[PDB]
Amino acid sequence: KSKLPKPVQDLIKMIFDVESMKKAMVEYEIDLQKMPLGKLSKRQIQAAYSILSEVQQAVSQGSSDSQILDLSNRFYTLIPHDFGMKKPPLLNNADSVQAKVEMLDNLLDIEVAYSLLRGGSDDSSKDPIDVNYEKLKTDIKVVDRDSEEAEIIRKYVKNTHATTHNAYDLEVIDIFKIEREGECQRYKPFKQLHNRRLLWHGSRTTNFAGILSQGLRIAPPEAPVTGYMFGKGIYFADMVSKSANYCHTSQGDPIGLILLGEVALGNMYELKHASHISKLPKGKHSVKGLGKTTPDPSANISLDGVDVPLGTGISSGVNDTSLLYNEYIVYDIAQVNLKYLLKLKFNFKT
Numbered sequence: 001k002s003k004l005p006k007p008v009q010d011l012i013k014m015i016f017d018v019e020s021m022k023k024a025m026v027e028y029e030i031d032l033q034k035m036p037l038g039k040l041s042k043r044q045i046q047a048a049y050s051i052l053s054e055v056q057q058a059v060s061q062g063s064s065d066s067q068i069l070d071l072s073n074r075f076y077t078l079i080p081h082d083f084g085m086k087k088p089p090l091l092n093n094a095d096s097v098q099a100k101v102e103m104l105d106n107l108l109d110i111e112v113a114y115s116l117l118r119g120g121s122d123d124s125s126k127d128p129i130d131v132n133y134e135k136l137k138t139d140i141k142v143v144d145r146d147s148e149e150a151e152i153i154r155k156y157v158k159n160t161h162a163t164t165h166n167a168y169d170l171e172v173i174d175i176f177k178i179e180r181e182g183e184c185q186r187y188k189p190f191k192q193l194h195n196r197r198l199l200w201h202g203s204r205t206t207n208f209a210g211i212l213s214q215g216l217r218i219a220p221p222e223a224p225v226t227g228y229m230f231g232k233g234i235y236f237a238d239m240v241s242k243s244a245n246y247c248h249t250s251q252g253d254p255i256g257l258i259l260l261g262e263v264a265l266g267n268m269y270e271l272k273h274a275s276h277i278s279k280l281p282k283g284k285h286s287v288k289g290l291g292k293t294t295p296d297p298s299a300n301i302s303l304d305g306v307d308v309p310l311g312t313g314i315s316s317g318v319n320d321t322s323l324l325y326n327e328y329i330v331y332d333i334a335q336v337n338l339k340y341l342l343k344l345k346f347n348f349k350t
């Protein structure tokens, strides 16, 4: 039976498991009993991205209101809601639409998770940890606990536990190091852009089955570039909080994955309200949301000339803005390299 170190095995059984896939889908409203995730298709999801984009032209451009209502009604058929009852939401504003843009994001990694699954195995020989983990195409080291490395890391969750989000408060269950296969290569280019930074990528867990196979990713062509504060790239945080929220760990599951990426920022476009891009102007190689808290300048460690902002909840001078913490974005995928995972226990304050 498996081989593997032991939270690697559990990591498999957490990130690879069927029940919870239904659970996300459920919380986006999705009507499992209409639309079973054997449905889930790259295909029917991609079509849905084009209808939410359909609604967007039209909303920012007047439109038949005899269009809008059916594009909503189109949005439904293809992605069946358990609603239900109660008065469904209209795709004729920015908000409700963006809402449905997350569900599809997620639908994407969840498909890739379950659809992942389906391959290897009447097997067995090679048991059900090493075949999933085998298909991850990723390798997983357990950082020892006592190490200055695990140490450093834990300062970083510490100090950038933020103010406002307390609360919950937070802790490190396991700490995995990762090379996924050949991502050195791709990043190669980007191993020599200036301004590189370890930042959090937090996501709902159900996601990491195909973030570990597909690498972190960006919305398809089909998707509303209005669906996203900075258009569609790849979003990242420096406070561990802004990211950790995205695990959607609740009172139970309270337990939840988070990435630490190397990211090749170079020249930061600094921004404060939304910019709907996907094209970055010339000479600029990432977007920055300029939230009012910065990780205190002061403390900024750098192993191999990546910066790490494990510095603590300080106030930036931006009052003026739409954010309260920073938000780094990069618009293609090569500019990222996954370094650590961490398993988190959410520990929800009293």
Ligand SMILES: Cc1cccc2c(=O)[nH]c(CCCN3CC=C(c4ccc(F)cc4)CC3)nc12
Residues within 6 Å of the ligand: 105, 106, 108, 109, 200, 201, 202, 203, 204, 207, 216, 217, 218, 219, 220, 235, 236, 237, 242, 243, 244, 246, 327
């Ligand atoms: C906003 C934002 C700002 C700052 C930090 C975070 C953060 O930590 N993560 C995420 C959400 C995680 C990414 N999710 C949306 C898009 C995904 C995606 C993935 C695959 C895919 F193919 C298309 C989109 C995955 C889930 N959003 C953040």
